[PDB]
Amino acid sequence: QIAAIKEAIAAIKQQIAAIKXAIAAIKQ
Amino acid sequence: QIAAIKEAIAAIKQQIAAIKXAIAAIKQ
Amino acid sequence: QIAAIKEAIAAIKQQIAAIKXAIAAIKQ
Protein backbone atom coordinates (compact mmCIF):
# COMPACT_ATOMS: atom_id res chain seq x y z
CA GLN A 1 0.00 0.00 0.00
CA ILE A 2 2.72 2.48 0.98
CA ALA A 3 4.80 1.73 -2.12
CA ALA A 4 1.74 2.11 -4.35
CA ILE A 5 1.00 5.47 -2.71
CA LYS A 6 4.57 6.63 -3.39
CA GLU A 7 4.21 5.34 -6.96
CA ALA A 8 0.98 7.25 -7.60
CA ILE A 9 2.22 10.50 -6.04
CA ALA A 10 5.34 10.49 -8.23
CA ALA A 11 3.15 10.07 -11.32
CA ILE A 12 1.00 13.01 -10.20
CA LYS A 13 4.15 15.13 -9.84
CA GLN A 14 5.21 14.48 -13.44
CA GLN A 15 1.60 15.08 -14.48
CA ILE A 16 1.70 18.41 -12.63
CA ALA A 17 4.96 19.21 -14.43
CA ALA A 18 3.39 18.63 -17.84
CA ILE A 19 0.40 20.79 -16.87
CA LYS A 20 2.73 23.65 -15.87
CA UNK A 21 4.60 23.20 -19.19
CA ALA A 22 1.36 23.39 -21.12
CA ILE A 23 0.22 26.55 -19.35
CA ALA A 24 3.62 28.17 -19.92
CA ALA A 25 3.38 27.55 -23.67
CA ILE A 26 -0.24 28.76 -23.77
CA LYS A 27 0.78 32.03 -22.10
CA GLN A 28 3.60 32.35 -24.65
CA GLN B 1 -4.37 7.71 7.82
CA ILE B 2 -3.75 5.31 4.92
CA ALA B 3 -7.43 5.35 3.94
CA ALA B 4 -7.51 9.15 3.97
CA ILE B 5 -4.33 9.26 1.88
CA LYS B 6 -5.87 6.94 -0.73
CA GLU B 7 -8.99 9.12 -0.94
CA ALA B 8 -6.96 12.32 -1.30
CA ILE B 9 -5.02 10.81 -4.20
CA ALA B 10 -8.24 9.58 -5.82
CA ALA B 11 -9.74 13.06 -5.47
CA ILE B 12 -6.54 14.61 -6.86
CA LYS B 13 -6.63 12.33 -9.92
CA GLN B 14 -10.16 13.50 -10.74
CA GLN B 15 -9.04 17.13 -10.51
CA ILE B 16 -6.09 16.32 -12.80
CA ALA B 17 -8.42 14.85 -15.42
CA ALA B 18 -10.62 17.95 -15.36
CA ILE B 19 -7.59 20.25 -15.61
CA LYS B 20 -6.36 18.40 -18.72
CA UNK B 21 -9.78 19.01 -20.34
CA ALA B 22 -9.64 22.70 -19.57
CA ILE B 23 -6.20 22.92 -21.15
CA ALA B 24 -7.29 20.93 -24.21
CA ALA B 25 -10.29 23.25 -24.53
CA ILE B 26 -7.97 26.27 -24.46
CA LYS B 27 -5.94 24.77 -27.32
CA GLN B 28 -9.07 24.40 -29.49
CA GLN C 1 7.20 7.66 5.08
CA ILE C 2 3.73 8.67 6.26
CA ALA C 3 4.83 12.24 7.03
CA ALA C 4 6.46 12.73 3.62
CA ILE C 5 3.35 11.40 1.86
CA LYS C 6 0.99 13.76 3.70
CA GLU C 7 3.35 16.72 3.24
CA ALA C 8 3.65 15.88 -0.47
CA ILE C 9 -0.13 15.79 -0.92
CA ALA C 10 -0.50 19.17 0.80
CA ALA C 11 2.02 20.63 -1.65
CA ILE C 12 0.20 19.04 -4.60
CA LYS C 13 -3.09 20.59 -3.46
CA GLN C 14 -1.42 24.01 -3.46
CA GLN C 15 -0.21 23.39 -7.01
CA ILE C 16 -3.69 22.29 -8.15
CA ALA C 17 -5.29 25.46 -6.78
CA ALA C 18 -2.67 27.65 -8.44
CA ILE C 19 -3.13 25.77 -11.73
CA LYS C 20 -6.91 26.25 -11.54
CA UNK C 21 -6.43 30.02 -10.98
CA ALA C 22 -3.91 30.26 -13.78
CA ILE C 23 -6.34 28.52 -16.13
CA ALA C 24 -9.18 30.78 -14.97
CA ALA C 25 -7.08 33.89 -15.66
CA ILE C 26 -6.33 32.48 -19.13
CA LYS C 27 -10.07 32.20 -19.85
CA GLN C 28 -10.50 35.85 -18.80
Ligand SMILES: [Cl-]
Ligand atom coordinates in the same frame (compact mmCIF):
# COMPACT_ATOMS: atom_id res chain seq x y z
CL1 LIG D 1 0.78 -3.54 2.32
Ligand SMILES: [Cl-]
Ligand atom coordinates in the same frame (compact mmCIF):
# COMPACT_ATOMS: atom_id res chain seq x y z
CL1 LIG E 1 5.05 -0.86 0.74
Ligand SMILES: [Cl-]
Ligand atom coordinates in the same frame (compact mmCIF):
# COMPACT_ATOMS: atom_id res chain seq x y z
CL1 LIG F 1 -4.38 5.47 11.38
Ligand SMILES: [Cl-]
Ligand atom coordinates in the same frame (compact mmCIF):
# COMPACT_ATOMS: atom_id res chain seq x y z
CL1 LIG G 1 -6.21 3.12 7.26
Ligand SMILES: [Cl-]
Ligand atom coordinates in the same frame (compact mmCIF):
# COMPACT_ATOMS: atom_id res chain seq x y z
CL1 LIG H 1 8.85 5.71 8.33
Ligand SMILES: [Cl-]
Ligand atom coordinates in the same frame (compact mmCIF):
# COMPACT_ATOMS: atom_id res chain seq x y z
CL1 LIG I 1 5.72 9.23 9.66
Ligand SMILES: [Cu+2]
Ligand atom coordinates in the same frame (compact mmCIF):
# COMPACT_ATOMS: atom_id res chain seq x y z
CU1 LIG J 1 -10.56 14.48 -27.92
Ligand SMILES: [Cu+2]
Ligand atom coordinates in the same frame (compact mmCIF):
# COMPACT_ATOMS: atom_id res chain seq x y z
CU1 LIG K 1 -14.78 32.52 -8.69
